[PDB]
Design an enzyme around this catalytic site. Sequence first.
Site, mmCIF file in Angstrom:
data_model
loop_
_atom_site.group_PDB
_atom_site.id
_atom_site.type_symbol
_atom_site.label_atom_id
_atom_site.label_comp_id
_atom_site.label_asym_id
_atom_site.label_seq_id
_atom_site.Cartn_x
_atom_site.Cartn_y
_atom_site.Cartn_z
ATOM 1 N N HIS A 97 0.833 -1.222 0.000
ATOM 2 C CA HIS A 97 0.000 0.000 0.000
ATOM 3 C C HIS A 97 0.862 1.265 0.000
ATOM 4 O O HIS A 97 0.339 2.351 -0.254
ATOM 5 C CB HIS A 97 -0.933 0.026 1.226
ATOM 6 N N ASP A 153 -2.223 -10.873 -1.963
ATOM 7 C CA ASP A 153 -2.797 -10.346 -0.724
ATOM 8 C C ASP A 153 -4.268 -9.972 -1.110
ATOM 9 O O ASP A 153 -4.523 -9.562 -2.252
ATOM 10 C CB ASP A 153 -1.994 -9.085 -0.320
ATOM 11 N N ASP A 193 -4.107 -13.032 3.623
ATOM 12 C CA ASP A 193 -5.376 -12.542 4.159
ATOM 13 C C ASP A 193 -6.561 -12.926 3.307
ATOM 14 O O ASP A 193 -7.700 -12.642 3.705
ATOM 15 C CB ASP A 193 -5.358 -11.026 4.472
ATOM 16 N N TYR A 236 -3.730 -12.212 8.769
ATOM 17 C CA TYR A 236 -3.905 -11.921 10.191
ATOM 18 C C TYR A 236 -4.371 -13.067 11.080
ATOM 19 O O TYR A 236 -4.309 -12.928 12.303
ATOM 20 C CB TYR A 236 -4.835 -10.686 10.325
ATOM 21 N N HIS A 268 -5.981 -7.467 -0.491
ATOM 22 C CA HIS A 268 -6.130 -6.037 -0.743
ATOM 23 C C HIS A 268 -5.358 -5.647 -1.999
ATOM 24 O O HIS A 268 -4.321 -6.246 -2.320
ATOM 25 C CB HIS A 268 -5.604 -5.215 0.448
HETATM 26 N N1 LIG Z 1 -2.375 -5.598 3.018
HETATM 27 N N2 LIG Z 1 -3.258 -4.647 3.570
HETATM 28 C C1 LIG Z 1 -3.926 -4.856 4.665
HETATM 29 O O1 LIG Z 1 -3.730 -6.032 5.271
HETATM 30 C C2 LIG Z 1 -4.879 -3.874 5.251
HETATM 31 C C3 LIG Z 1 -4.576 -2.500 5.338
HETATM 32 C C4 LIG Z 1 -5.508 -1.640 5.936
HETATM 33 C C5 LIG Z 1 -6.710 -2.153 6.419
HETATM 34 C C6 LIG Z 1 -7.734 -1.210 7.039
HETATM 35 N N3 LIG Z 1 -8.212 -1.829 8.272
HETATM 36 N N4 LIG Z 1 -9.100 -2.760 8.332
HETATM 37 N N5 LIG Z 1 -9.245 -3.117 9.562
HETATM 38 C C7 LIG Z 1 -8.375 -2.398 10.284
HETATM 39 C C8 LIG Z 1 -8.182 -2.470 11.751
HETATM 40 C C9 LIG Z 1 -8.701 -3.561 12.469
HETATM 41 C C10 LIG Z 1 -8.519 -3.596 13.847
HETATM 42 C C11 LIG Z 1 -7.792 -2.565 14.449
HETATM 43 C C12 LIG Z 1 -7.298 -1.512 13.676
HETATM 44 N N6 LIG Z 1 -7.480 -1.506 12.361
HETATM 45 N N7 LIG Z 1 -7.757 -1.585 9.451
HETATM 46 N N8 LIG Z 1 -6.965 -3.451 6.311
HETATM 47 C C13 LIG Z 1 -6.085 -4.314 5.820
HETATM 48 K K LIG Z 2 -3.675 -8.072 -4.227
HETATM 49 ZN ZN LIG Z 3 -3.937 -7.137 2.892
#
Ligand SMILES: NNC(=O)c1ccc(Cn2nnc(-c3ccccn3)n2)nc1
Ligand SMILES: [K+]
Ligand SMILES: [Zn+2]
Length: 356
Positions: free
Chosen positions: A134, A172, A265, A305, A174
């Site tokens: 990202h 991934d 993920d 995760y 995302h």
């Molecule tokens: N490879 N990218 C990602 O793996 C990616 C990046 C950004 C996000 C946004 N997000 N979703 N849930 C959260 C979250 C959940 C719990 C506590 C704080 N934050 N944050 N999601 C996934």
């Molecule tokens: K991807």
């Molecule tokens: Zn991701």
Amino acid sequence: SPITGLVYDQRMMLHHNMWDSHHPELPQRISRIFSRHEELRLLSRCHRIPARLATEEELALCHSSKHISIIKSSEHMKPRDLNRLGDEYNSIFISNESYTCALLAAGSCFNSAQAILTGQVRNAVAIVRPPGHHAEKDTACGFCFFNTAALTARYAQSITRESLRVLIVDWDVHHGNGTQHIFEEDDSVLYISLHRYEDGAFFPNSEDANYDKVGLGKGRGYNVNIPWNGGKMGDPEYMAAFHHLVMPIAREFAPELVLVSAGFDAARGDPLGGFQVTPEGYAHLTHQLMSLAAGRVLIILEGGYNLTSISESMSMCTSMLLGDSPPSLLTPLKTSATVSINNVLRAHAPFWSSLR
Ligand SMILES: NNC(=O)c1ccc(Cn2nnc(-c3ccccn3)n2)nc1
Ligand SMILES: [K+]
Ligand SMILES: [Zn+2]
Ligand SMILES: [K+]
């Protein structure tokens, strides 16, 4: 030579969320994956590649001097200023150790790409954090500080030739917004991403992740987005995307190096992804990529995760790189997955003869 490299350094666990110790991008993501490699007796079968810090000149391959300086300055910030700094970005937490960890994740992959290109190893796995896909030229985003995979493609070109054909497969769940943007006008780096999209409801919530974003100028046809909508996709859908799109395009491009932005993920059990790719599914995707670039594949950890799911899925990838037989692998596809595959085929048929 017919050897697999592995890089892991426990110092990358130091990057943490001081306000929310349960944040899913946990220090133990990498220690659990490494422990699973020991349990499965995979570690001793690998050539251990040392981690190193990326240098600021190496970060400058993809990132602005301003971005590098800001992240570098976080090492010396008090908690309230790290809170303020992290808030400047979309979904970022910072500690005094974050910058050093981001440097170690990048340097580890450079040493891995170097071991492959010098012929020390055929392929390699990099158990690294924080993730990178990202991260943009000028900004941090979605738990990512520097774009590790994008920087590795530029590093690989810096030790061979500027025109070295690099394929980045980003599995991934995302969209790797930073990777797409870094190489959008580039025909030497083919970016292929499979990602949950939901018409922009899924992170990073941009139409930049849609199938019609095919690249710009000389990069037209070198950006392949495979977006999933309305469905909890799994092995049948991912196998189909590889059959109809990833492998025909990759074979026509003929890469000299394959980098995998390997987030786990999209795996069964992931609380953020909502998908059902199995460890055997990832093993089949890895085995397919090994038929490219004379087996020169580097698997770089991104997201993922569920600690058990990522440990099993990544270990399964390493097993495939070591030459182990692909495990037994389903069903007809979700109707929306056929819609997605067909949309990508229509978007990329003008640029790839294998799709026509
Ligand atoms: N490879 N990218 C990602 O793996 C990616 C990046 C950004 C996000 C946004 N997000 N979703 N849930 C959260 C979250 C959940 C719990 C506590 C704080 N934050 N944050 N999601 C996934
Ligand atoms: K991807
Ligand atoms: Zn991701
Ligand atoms: K590109």
